[PDB]
Amino acid sequence: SMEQVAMELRLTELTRLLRSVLDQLQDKDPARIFAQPVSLKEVPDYLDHIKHPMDFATMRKRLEAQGYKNLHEFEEDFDLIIDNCMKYNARDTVFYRAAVRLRDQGGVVLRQARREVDSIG
């Protein structure tokens, strides 16, 4: 149908916007601490601690399959990156600290993304 097409154009444009959001958030991680899945070879117990692992490469795979229906879904995944780290790693670690800085800096990008998603529909 023409409606299904219109819908798919909206999803494609959301994907366009979320791809830009993703690039902006990932720039706030210049150390690349969150770029890839935590290695289960290198942290073999990880899944005993963290039930839903997340990372920026995993988000990008989902993004490129148009797997985020709305900004809320995307933000859920971003928040998992941060919250997983802040639980697994102690407060005094470079990892925890990287997550705090990512959360704080990402807030700004996400605040305007939400306005853009609502604004453009």
Resolution in angstroms, to 1 decimal, for this deposition?
1.5
Question: 26 to each of 4, 69, 92, how far by Cα in Å?
Answer: 32, 20, 22
Domains of the chain: 1-121 (1.20.920.10)
Experimental method: X-ray
In degrees, rounded to 5, the angle at the alpha carbon of residue 13 between the alpha carbons of residues 9 and 16 is 140
Burial bucket for residue 52 (CB in 10 Å: 0-12, 13-18, 19+): exposed
Residue burial 58-78, b: 16+ Cβ < 10 Å; e: rest: ebbeebeeeebeebeebbebb
Of 47, 29, 27, which Cα lies nearest the Cα of 38? 47
- Between CA 95 and CA 90 the distance in angstroms is 8
